[PDB]
């Protein structure tokens, strides 16, 4: 998380941290608990290549990484069939947990939006994660979960910004309709934040507007962060997730 502060213990109970085996079960992506048996993440975290599930664990909402860890096994990885790369699109995936989580005050699910939801600029949105604090700058120990309020930008406005200082033809779409834009040069998500949630307050409820996907650098001029538009893939999510 570029910009922003350390999240309070209470806030973001749906926040998960994806782990990879090695000298330790190291954090590499974030995700959200959308059901007691399901996690919503970015396809690029776990694909397009088939991954050995022995090498993956899920860690539920905790304030700091590695201090009070209780690693949960994954039984299935479901990557959207249309996914190859983040810039192409369909950077969305589901993890089915081997055991259902016992939901509580500190650990519970995030609400997905209706299809009709547009998430226009002005919307109070927040992105959360344990990823890079700046370009090629890791989150230092004690690894607190970070939060940043990011401004929503319209797709055409964002796509126009993405063309500034680029050879790519103006008629050539960069920001695709399955994508969503948020951030500026001071507030943004970064590498290691992928899969994590972009939530917005809509009539007193937190709805996951997006999934941390890609972007050119981290909080770079005319390069807002690009998130997968959750509304676009609702039908696919609900084919698996109750």
């Amino acid at each position, epitope marked *: 998380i570029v910009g922003g502060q350390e999240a309070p213990r209470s806030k973001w109970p749906w926040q998960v941290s994806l*782990r990879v*085996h090695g000298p330790y*079960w190291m954090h590499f992506c974030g995700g959200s608990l959308i059901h007691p048996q399901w996690v919503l993440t970015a396809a690029h975290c776990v694909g397009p290549d088939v991954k050995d*599930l*022995a090498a993956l*664990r899920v860690q539920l909402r905790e304030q700091h990484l590695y201090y009070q*860890d*209780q*690693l*949960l*096994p*994954v*039984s*299935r990885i479901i990557v959207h069939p249309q996914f190859y790369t983040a810039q192409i699109g369909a950077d969305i995936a589901l993890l089915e947990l*081997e*055991e259902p989580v016992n939901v509580s005050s500190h650990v519970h699910t995030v609400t997905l939006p209706p299809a009709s939801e547009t998430f226009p600029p002005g919307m109070p949105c927040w992105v959360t994660g344990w990823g890079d604090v700046d370009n090629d700058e890791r989150l230092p120990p004690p690894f607190p979960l970070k939060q940043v309020k990011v401004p929503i930008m319209e797709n055409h406005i964002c796509d126009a910004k993405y063309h500034l200082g680029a050879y790519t033809g103006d008629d050539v779409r960069i920001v695709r309709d399955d994508m969503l834009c948020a951030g500026n040069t001071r507030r943004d998500s970064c590498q290691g934040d992928s899969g994590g949630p972009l939530v917005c307050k809509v009539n007193g409820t937190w709805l996951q507007a997006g999934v941390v996907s890609w972007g050119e650098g981290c909080a770079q001029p005319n390069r807002p962060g690009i998130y997968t538009r959750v509304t676009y893939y609702l039908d696919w999510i609900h084919h698996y997730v109750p």
Partner: antibody
Amino acid sequence: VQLVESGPGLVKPSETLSLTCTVSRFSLIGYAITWIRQPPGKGLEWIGGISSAATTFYSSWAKSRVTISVDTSKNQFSLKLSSVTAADTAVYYCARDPRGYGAALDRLDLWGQGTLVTVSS
Amino acid sequence: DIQMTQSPSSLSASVGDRVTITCQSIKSVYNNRLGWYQQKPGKAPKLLIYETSILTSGVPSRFSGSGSGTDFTLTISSLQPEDFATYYCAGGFDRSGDTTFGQGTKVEIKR
């Protein structure tokens, strides 16, 4: 990496056999340990197991008379089998599921050396 | 505690012979959750094949796993004298306790 079974070799009937699996030069944080037994000359039988998330799963038989636990501080896993008969005389194994499953059997990569438990008066 | 059938229960084959051990169940295997073990006398079983067809690293290429659902096969393309052991298949039908081992197959060398 090594797994070691520890416990009494001889148990009188009606009593409770208590075994421990200890995991040297590694603390398996994201892993699961299952217990398997093998009557002499007979085949492999699953007793039960504990998951990556400390969840216990017990076989059809046993269930009622079996208890599996973890002492992370000691790097130990326990097995307690009450009201033992000569039918419980077997070689007791503890094995690891590298996916940290708890109720798996199809991918037991690391195994203990096995411990013979004889139930006799 | 029987849910999976190995065939044969014991077999005898010459060195260099192709050996086929089949593992069958009435319920279908959960998520390709079928592994093969080799147990040499007085030793803990060894995982040879896991998740139906994946070979444990270091295990010779003469060992291969095949099949799906309810019917599976362990193949030993050219049986070696060291390959004498009891072979066990083991499967999972759910994630909460419906897992068993097969009967076992004692593979004997013919000389």
